[model samples]
Target: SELYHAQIHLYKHVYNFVSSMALKSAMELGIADAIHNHGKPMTLSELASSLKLHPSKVNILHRFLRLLTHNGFFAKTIVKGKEGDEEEEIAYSLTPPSKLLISGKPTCLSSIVKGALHPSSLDMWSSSKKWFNEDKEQTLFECATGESFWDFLNKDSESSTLSMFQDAMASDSRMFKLVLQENKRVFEGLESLVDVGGGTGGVTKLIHEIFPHLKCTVFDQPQVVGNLTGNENLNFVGGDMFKSIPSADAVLLKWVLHDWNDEQSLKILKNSKEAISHKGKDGKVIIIDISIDETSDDRGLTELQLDYDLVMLTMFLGKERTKQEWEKLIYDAGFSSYKITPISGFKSLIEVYP
Candidate 1:
């Protein structure tokens, strides 16, 4: 009990990177969907078969599963043999969190996993030291590849890296279905709504499906929404949020604010306010984003949130906000009242009244 823990502490810091890689491996292997479709406990052999792992890699695969199970992404159980036999086989199943990673589910989070852990995204961290010493105003991306992430993606349109980035956002969009399902009341009494920066209309489609009466518009940069077509209840509008937002009963912002500074956020909020002012319905701005509780009892969750906060800062010069920071932004945007409701595990849905 009195053993020195210095090495443990050091390894904890160094080995933290392993967690993201492990999650990436799970996504690559389709581990969550495999177990989910199995419809029962999956033996290591069964899982390996589904993954079509090479014979030589079965053991390696087993070891990977064991680590993820130990880390709570999966549950391990022992299956007893018949009384005449004398053996038990360890089986694995998805934990609640991993169940959310199921590929076909509307709430699947595999995109966020893939996008955040992709090599293109991860490689930026390698240039951290050089980034600090450089006088360039560009981001770490520019330091690493001499181009920004956006330009890099655009130039490499045919590259799998670009696909990974889009896939990640698509998966994240699928999960917003659960938000609409749980908060149907928010959409009620509203005739129309615009999804600001809603790439590809993933969330907007779900809104139209759930509440067919509500008119929905996918608003984003011209390049993102230009060619997409929409129907009667849903339409695509290409424009800048800072310049204007198409008028609607409410403006929906999901995971959009974390990408900007307070000043930029206020500009978007002001534009949103102007968009809904003509509607004559006490227009509200709905924001979906993370809210960290520093005082929470869950130290592990708090640490993960803070770690991700730094990742956003280092990569995009963005910052995750605390509840106090959110309050300050809302008030600064000239909002009179607001309510924050926790939706999925790590994010909260905020309704700000103007």
Candidate 2:
């Protein structure tokens, strides 16, 4: 049994890439939405009809569905026959997680699924070895395409690559709305806040809609916030957080500090402290990012966090921090006290008082 378990572990790691590819194939085939629209367990023939596949490829699609079903993205059942002859036809249905991948849903994570599994993103893994050996200061994207991911997106806005990137971030922000609802008290006392590095106002828009009285500003580089208009409660400001942040009652840093090391993050935190210190007693700073814990009960979840750490390392030479690391940074930045509430499963919302 031990030997069998070891072999299973090896095979699982080796074939892990297939899991992503299988999900991508399912998305491309519109499997989830198709089953959803059908409103019931779909027979193989019915599913094939929805996809409109070539007759020759029907079996191939069936094979693909069987693999995915075995992997838990779908369910299957055997239909009983009316007569003495036994009949077994597979009927497909979406699992709970797969249902979230349906397009047009408010909580749809399809874009994030597609974006992370996109060829451009996936190809970076192949260059990981070279990235480790080389000292050319090239990212995985640059190693693969001689350009950064951001540069590639700028040059090819219409490309699926760019679209996937934007959609991934947008989808992520949509999920953050759920976090706000779950932790409504976090924003209760704050009258004004600044969303540093908030992209295109996705998170801020949701926040404004939820708490209309809370005045918010989107702060980022000129290129990110330029030419964008703002409403009464929400506005856009272009500036560098390292240099200075626009003063507000609270400074909101979402998915920003994870891209930097201790010194750089400290600089941002110092600026944030100054921004919030202007408000005196009521000033605070909020951060939303991953805080990895090796001792977590869920091994799979912790492993995924470490896996993402490797991703950040390979892509941007960045990292996901531990709770100790976060605490060090917060204290070093002269925060009085801090509290962290786990929000999006693997990420935590940190509140620091000046």
Candidate 3:
């Protein structure tokens, strides 16, 4: 029995990619969008027709839907036949997870699904063995592709890929609107704010909407903010974070620090500290990133965090810091004090004081 259980576990792990691919297919086919637009549970035939799948491929679609329903992206409902001779039909309905895949919704995450599962992202894994054996300090992505991930995204030929990535980030930033609603005090006293590494001002726009008087600057790479135009209250400035940041009462680093090593992150933090130095002891920096809990009893959530740590490692030679690591980093950056609050289930908001 023990051996049988072990085999089952190993097999499940090996087949995990299939589940991810199935979910990707669901997003590509607009399955969630179909159901959402219909405004009701869709029977198998109805879904197939709406998706424009050929009649011959209906059973294949059904198979995919069966696995997806089992995986919880969707739920199954049965409509009972009105007559004795009629057969009951099983219908599909969007679950909370699936609802995020519906395009045009503020919560839509289909771009993340597309970007994360893109061929360029997946093909790098084939170089993992080479990366492990090499003494060179570089990312697995660099090993597989001669260029860094950033360079690849910036290439003119890869504009679509860059847009996909930016779209994913924007969708995620939209979710921060909910966080701001819950944590209004985080931005209450801020007179001016700079969103470090803010791409196309996604989070900055959200913050601007809530605090119209707050002078907001979206600081990012020269190319990212070159064409973007913002109102007088909300503006875009392009520069390197390691060198300097725009002066503000507070600096907002959302999902940015996780892409750098400790040494690099420290430089950015120091620059941020300097940016707000005019406020003296009143200066602050707000960071949103994963703070892994090594002692957490929730194994599933911890596993996801660790998985993200590996993703950062393989792609950018970066890390997702634990709470202790965060503490060390904050103090090393010369911050007087800091407080962390759990937000968005998996990530934390760290408020660092001068």
Candidate 4:
């Protein structure tokens, strides 16, 4: 039994790429858009026709749909045949997850699927052996490509890669609307806030939706915010977080800390502390990142957290901290206490007090 079970587990893990690639194909084919625009469940033939696939590819699309439907992206339902016979046909509808892939929607995350599953992003894994064996401290990406990931993005000949990754980040930030709505209390009392690494003010604009009167500054690299314009209550500032952050009632570090090592994160946290010190005990630093809980019974969620941790480790030389690690990091940065609340599923919203 043990040997059989082990074999099954091994084979299941080996075939995981099939499921991921199938989802990528679904996104590429705009299956969700086809179903969404159809205004009703789409039969396989209907989907095939709407997607403009050739007659030869209709059966191939059906196979992919079967796999995707089984994976919970698309729901399958039986419908009476259009020929007016007693025969039945399977119709596909978008589930909650697939709805996220529909184009033009604010919550659309197809760009994330596009960038993360791109061949370049996946190719670095092949260098894991060299990366692990080398004494030099560099990312697996660097080991594979002989240059840092950041450099690659900035120097890509077509600039498409950079734009693609940026689009992915913007789409992810757009989803923060739901999160900000749920966590309104975090920003209630702050008169002003600064978004560290805000990058074109995606999350900052969402914050303004709930609190129009609050002063918001989008802080990022000089080049990033150089030509951007803003209004009375919202503006873009360029500076280095490790050096200093612009003062505000609170500091928002959404999805920023996970990109750096502990030392760099601590530096940013300390600067954040300094930026908000004018308010003394009233100052708070809000962090949004993955807080891995090893004890949780949710294997899927835990595995995703660890997977992100390795992605960070390999691509950015960073990490996703567990609860204990968060505590220590917060304390080490001179913060007295913090509260962690889960948000956006795998990530957590932390309120750190000075």
Candidate 5:
């Protein structure tokens, strides 16, 4: 019966979360770095030795490895036999996602799992139903803990909130390596670009690294840019995005707009449009974010997108937008047309022409 399928589907959702936890455990265990420092496709034995787990728990480590491999965080392959031996062994290699987890790697965002799985973040889910039921204007996080997630982070200095944010932003910057090579044509003639809310400089640095001659400016809040410096081809500016953005051939809104509601996002877009249009009619806005759609062919990907959507809703009263929703926002902000290309799975690179 359909109901039978529905009941089992619910359980599937229930257990699916365990995979994330397993990945989290692996990060805290430093599995990615262990494998990397191993400098080869690490055999189970090598990985266990590096982890310093007791001999008996080598088998236990295998279980965790098995789950992560199935979930795509690690790649499992058979190692060929040594010169004369016929025996082969199983080994693990870092996949793209796990590569991003290796400690101190420029792309690493392993810290995200820590924040996402933290009690400060997850415990709020218990009061989600209450949040949905109440007419009060508080988020699930606020309802559960009495303060916003930002406030919690500000007070928890040892928690490394700024580092986590920078890592997530840097994690995104690495994707532009693909963007620069595959979509060089997208940025070819652009004389200058401004990365709004990017005064943190991760994305701005990445952009300048690829296009050294292309002038780059990192625009953000006055509080952040006050203590920053940059070189000849790149610089920093601090201001409100809703009020104004620095003029450039293009205004980059990477991972910025999702933090606000429609009205607020629209205002930011309007300011962005004006910023780009001020120079000429040929300006554009480049956005890097998750673009959700109903008919996504990849159910696994769709589920991940929806999960992030809920994260936005519960954490900050924000959301990931569907393509139609994005189009409306772009058009409503007075942009004439736009295009979206998936730069990485679950996230999109959108170019909005003014």
Candidate 6:
């Protein structure tokens, strides 16, 4: 079992980039939706016709389809028509994975993949080895480009890369609305909530949409929240998260603390705990983040989380915490108790009590 695993296992790691690129190609080529609209399984020619792909590239489409089908993006059926040749022909049908790539679908994740697999993102990894030896606090990107990601974005706010990242974040936020719908009980009886680092009030707007009675506020850096306006129950406040967060029944830190180191995250968590302390035992700080537990029965989820853990470290000098790591952080922040509810796959809803 030892040497037998080398080629298959090591080669998969070596060639995994091809998988992501193939997926990106599938999205850009609209291969998934093309078959979906065809109303039935498709022959190679039919797929090429729908995508307006060149006739000469029909074989090329076959190659891509072969890999994707093997990867579960599609199902290949062997069909023999009345006038079929000796060998049955292959017809491709959309799989659940491909259906999720359909545009405007509730579970669509194409944009997320698109942003993550962008050329610039891959290029950043070239500087990774250089970053490892450096004693500086800069992230791999900053080490390579001589500018932090935030500063880079601030310098060119109109960059296409920034737009792509925004699209991915927005799509992810919409997907979380489903999480909220499914986990409504988690928010019930909450009088008010402050979404720390809530960008453009996107998450808060969705929360307000579902729970009209609950007051919601979007809290972030002054420059980010200053330009935004809200009506009635929805408002935006600007301040330093380390110094203070707006007091509320609950503080929602969705995808925030991971961008910071332990000490910084601890400061934010302490502030968050203080923000909710006025409510006594019922007070809580709600953190929605990736809590990786390697012993998970879901192998796919564990792999996703470990990959994301690298993304965090390379991008922000952060790492996704394990359950034990999370418990330490909660207690280090002086929180007495906590709970993790698996809401989104690979991501969890953590409730930390003061």
Most lDDT-accurate candidate = 4
* 76 Cα displacement, candidate 3 (Å): 1.3
Worst 10 residues of 2 by lDDT: 78-87
TM-score of each: 0.79, 0.82, 0.80, 0.84, 0.79, 0.83
How do the residues 1-354 of candidate 5 rate in per-residue lDDT, one tens digit apiece? 556778887898789878878988999899999988888898888888889999998988999999889989899878975448758988899998888788886556676667677666677788978888888897788988888877877775636765576566556667677676677777888999998998578777777777889998999999998868768778889888888989999988887887778899999999999888766778889988889877878777877788888888888887788988899899999998898887665788899987
lDDT of each: 0.84, 0.85, 0.89, 0.90, 0.83, 0.86
Ranking by TM-score: 4, 6, 2, 3, 5, 1
> Which prediction has the highest TM-score against the true structure?
4
Quickly count the clashes in candidate 1. Answer: 0
Candidate 6 clashes between residue pairs 3 or more apart in a chain or in different chains: none
Q: Write the per-residue lDDT of candidate 1 for residues 195-268, one digit (tens) a residue.
A: 99989887777888789899899999999987888588888999888899999999998888978889999899
- Give the per-residue Cα lDDT of candidate 3 at 90: 90
After superposition, candidate 2 runs with Cα above 4 Å error: 1-5, 78-88, 153-158, 197-202, 218-232, 235-249, 274-283, 343-345
Candidate 5 wrong stretches, greater than 4 Å: 1-3, 75-89, 156-182, 196-203, 217-247, 259-261, 267-281
The segments of candidate 6 whose C-alpha lies over 4 angstroms from its true place after superposition are 1-5, 79-88, 124-139, 142-159, 220-230, 236-245
Sequence-dependent TM-score of model 4: 0.84
Cα RMSD of all models vs. native, in order, equals 4.0, 3.7, 4.1, 3.3, 3.9, 3.6
- Candidate 3 lDDT tens digits, 262-295: 8989999999999999999998999999999888
Order the numbered candidates by lDDT, best leading: 4, 3, 6, 2, 1, 5
* Backbone clashes, each candidate: 0, 0, 0, 0, 0, 0
What candidate 4 gets wrong by more than 4 Å, as runs, is 1-3, 84-86, 134-137, 151-159, 196-203, 217-232, 235-248, 259-264, 267-282, 333-336
Q: Write the per-residue lDDT of candidate 6 for residues 62-127, one digit (tens) a residue.
A: 898899999999998877742645556788998877888888788888888887887656789888
Cα error, candidate 6, residue 98 (Å): 1.5
Error of 1 at 299 (Å): 4.3
Alpha-carbon error at 199 in model 4, in Å?
6.6
